[PDB]
Design a protein around this ligand. Structure first.
Ligand SMILES: CCCCC(=O)NCc1cccc(-n2ncc(-c3cc4cnccc4[nH]3)c2O)c1
Ligand SMILES: [Ca+2]
Ligand SMILES: [Cl-]
Ligand SMILES: [Cl-]
Ligand SMILES: [Cl-]
Lengths: 249, 58
């Protein structure tokens, strides 16, 4: 996160840290006690699928304060329509090996109904993006969880205001064109969270494309397109082998 | 009332029905109040709420 602030400890309680062999991989979002939403692209180069770890209740990476909860990732589910190394359909559903325990510091973000998301949430100007990503383009990553308020753009406006992947119906633009404020490498898979009438909802996933590049906006996976897909999967029995490609729609 | 407008007055989820009918709904871990629009938590840690902040104003 570029041009943000530290998310006060416990104020981003749905934020997930993904690790591979103890190394920072990506962000994620807790939506239930055993389910995490991330970005497909995070898994492009994964060799040993069995060394994936999800951490909840994380804040300061430099220390252990006992609010942290680590779980093995039992399943990584990606849509059939996702092509590695690309941007479209940049979403993943992760099944934890064991549920996390809900606490003051560990809480899921509401996965909204599609209709609600499309009709209402999609028109809430500002939303929050978070992670332990790069604080600057070509810079070091954050030790403390960062958060950033970003405005959402209608895709037409995004295109107009911008000055190379298409912006598809499975995506949306959010942020600023002045290169001051953005999500960045290391943030991918993290939440784009939208407030409505006292409650927070999952509207976006930090995807990819540099960061805080003048004339460009941040690109986010449009979660609304995937609600039904996610819901169906969450009702499904686990399958052997970590990686699962599931048909989309 | 219609769901597309003002969220049908619903705090959360909204369903249009046959006629001048509307039904509001609430996410798991919430229940719908008698006003037919409002949602109240039924659990300790409902989704999309920040405990330290909820407490901060409790
Ligand atoms: C091409 C890359 C090398 C191939 C490779 O390693 N693929 C697997 C992988 C696994 C985990 C993370 C990444 N990864 N690389 C770049 C970005 C990224 C840039 C960016 C800008 N703005 C916002 C978010 C952003 N995210 C990113 O998330 C790739
Ligand atoms: Ca810590
Ligand atoms: Cl575990
Ligand atoms: Cl099944
Ligand atoms: Cl495997």
């Amino acid at each position: 996160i570029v041009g943000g602030k530290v998310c006060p400890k416990g104020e981003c309680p749905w934020q997930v840290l993904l690790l591979v062999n103890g190394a920072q991989l990506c962000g994620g979002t807790l939506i239930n006690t055993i389910w995490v939403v991330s970005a497909a692209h995070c898994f492009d180069k994964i060799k040993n699928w069995r060394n994936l770890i999800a951490v909840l209740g994380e804040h300061d990476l430099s220390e252990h304060d006992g609010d942290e909860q680590s779980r093995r990732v039992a399943q990584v589910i990606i849509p059939s329509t996702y092509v590695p190394g690309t941007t479209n359909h940049d979403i993943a559903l992760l099944r934890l090996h064991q549920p996390v325990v809900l606490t003051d510091h560990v809480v899921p973000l509401c996965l909204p109904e599609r209709t609600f998301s499309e009709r209402t949430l999609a028109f809430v100007r500002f939303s929050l993006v978070s992670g332990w990503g790069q604080l600057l383009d070509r810079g070091a990553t954050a030790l403390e969880l960062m958060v950033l308020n970003v405005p959402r753009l209608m895709t037409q406006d995004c295109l107009q205001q911008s000055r190379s992947p298409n912006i598809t119906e499975y995506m949306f633009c959010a942020g600023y064109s002045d290169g001051s404020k953005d999500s960045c490498k290391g943030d991918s898979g993290g939440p784009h969270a939208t407030h409505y009438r006292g409650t927070w909802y999952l509207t976006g996933i930090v995807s990819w494309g540099g960061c805080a590049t003048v004339g460009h906006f941040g690109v986010y996976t449009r979660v609304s397109q995937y609600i039904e897909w996610l819901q169906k999967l969450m009702r499904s029995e686990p399958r052997p082998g970590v990686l699962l490609r599931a048909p989309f729609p | 009332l219609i769901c597309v407008n003002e969220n049908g007055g619903c705090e959360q989820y909204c369903s249009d029905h046959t006629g001048t009918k509307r039904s509001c709904r609430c996410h798991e871990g919430y229940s719908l109040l008698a006003d037919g629009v409002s949602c109240t938590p039924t659990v300790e840690y409902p989704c999309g709420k920040i405990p330290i902040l909820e407490k901060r104003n409790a």
